[PDB]
Design a binder for this molecule. Structure first.
Ligand SMILES: Nc1ncnc2c1ncn2[C@@H]1O[C@H](COP(=O)(O)OP(=O)(O)NP(=O)(O)O)[C@@H](O)[C@H]1O
Ligand SMILES: *[C@@H]1[C@@H](C(=O)OCc2ccccc2)C(=O)CC[C@]1(C)C(=O)OC
Length: 349
């Protein structure tokens, strides 16, 4: 089997000519050539079966991305794994090949207002479809916004995605321990339940701010420092803001901090389009119930030159997982992953 940076990529003979792209905390991603369809592809290798939480990420990503079909959301073309469950140690997810991601782009390039506007439009267009299926992405960030040579944008990395159900869901804390928290909504760090579609809008606002300045707007080292970054710009929460914190210990924690004045957006972004800052203000609202919704954002004057609801599709029906996964042992999750990937095996019946 072909080898990339001393790592086995056992994907031949169909997929050949592998080249390292990059990696996240869980997967190593290569470009490859599909000799059957005669097209370029991306291939993500993950090795999750020794960790319950990694098994959760793999099963969630596979189940959701195989049900979604949208221009601004990455698709899964193929999945490779061993013919028996005992032999299955790695999973290879084959996707359309993109050229870069927004994290890498912002490291080398400053974006014009027209590019910012277009990227933001495509993010929200994809997010509109995700939310129309009653799904929360929960981990939006520059590194999982993929870009191609023609400036098309696709959202990827759905391992933390969940069906929205604030009143009856008990996900608890984001059991994610290796990746960045700079894009996480304040209520995530203050509460362990009741997450709504507004958490994704907060993330998009953080991404907008970073496109405006090429620097992350709230780059804390831990949740403690992270909250101080947020409050240092939004100012101390209002009385109504305090009423939306459910955890009384978290509310009493916020009450114990010194007072902080709000910083005007045009002090942070003095050269930015005023319409961009108006939309930014409505996305980075402390109170999730007052935060702008995805359809309202698409209709905001900042995005006027691209907004087109006739060409902003939605899901036919809200997505469902068909079971809860948080309490299953990793051995059971391994069986579910095997079953979910059997449709890509020869002889599936
Ligand atoms: N289809 C793709 N085409 C091109 N590059 C891709 C593709 N999928 C992923 N990448 C790159 O690979 C990186 C890692 O992918 P990702 O799906 O985020 O991996 P992960 O380890 O499972 N989760 P995370 O730690 O959140 O990044 C991305 O940030 C992109 O740079
Ligand atoms: C997109 C690309 C480009 O020229 O896009 C033109 C454009 C104008 C207005 C609105 C939207 C797009 C460019 O020059 C920068 C590279 C970029 C960002 C791209 O190729 O992404 C990888």
């Amino acid at each position: 089997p072909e080898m990339v940076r001393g790592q086995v990529f056992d994907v031949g003979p169909r997929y050949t000519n592998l080249s390292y792209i990059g990696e996240g905390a869980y997967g190593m991603v290569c470009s490859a050539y599909d000799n059957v369809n005669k097209v370029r592809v991306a291939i993500k290798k993950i090795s999750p079966f020794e960790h319950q939480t990694y098994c959760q990420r793999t099963l969630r990503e596979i189940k959701i991305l195989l049900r979604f079909r949208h221009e601004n959301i990455i698709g899964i073309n193929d999945i490779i794994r061993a013919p028996t469950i005992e032999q299955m140690k790695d999973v290879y997810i084959v996707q359309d090949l993109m050229e870069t991601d927004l994290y890498k782009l912002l490291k080398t390039q400053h974006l014009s207002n027209d590019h910012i506007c277009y990227f933001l439009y495509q993010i929200l267009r994809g997010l509109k479809y995700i939310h129309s299926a009653n799904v929360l992405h929960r981990d939006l960030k520059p590194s999982n916004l993929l870009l191609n040579t023609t400036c098309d944008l696709k959202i990827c990395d759905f391992g933390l995605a969940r069906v929205a159900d604030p009143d009856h869901d008990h996900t608890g804390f984001l059991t994610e321990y290796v990746a960045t928290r700079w894009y996480r909504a304040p209520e995530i760090m203050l509460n362990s339940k009741g997450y709504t579609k507004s958490i994704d809008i907060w993330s998009v606002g953080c991404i907008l701010a970073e496109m405006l300045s090429n620097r992350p707007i709230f780059p804390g080292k831990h949740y403690l420092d992270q909250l101080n970054h947020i409050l240092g710009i939004l100012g101390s929460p209002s009385q109504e803001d305090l009423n939306c914190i459910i955890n009384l210990k978290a509310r009493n924690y916020l009450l114990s901090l010194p007072h902080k004045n709000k910083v005007p957006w045009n002090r942070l972004f003095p050269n930015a389009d005023s319409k961009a800052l108006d939309l930014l203000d409505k996305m980075l609202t402390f109170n999730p119930h007052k935060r702008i919704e995805v359809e309202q954002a698409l209709a905001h004057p900042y995005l006027e030159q691209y907004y087109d609801p006739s060409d902003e599709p939605i899901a036919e029906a809200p997505f469902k997982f068909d079971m809860e996964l948080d309490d299953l042992p990793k051995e059971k999750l391994k069986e579910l992953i095997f079953e979910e990937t059997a449709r890509f095996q020869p002889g599936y019946r």
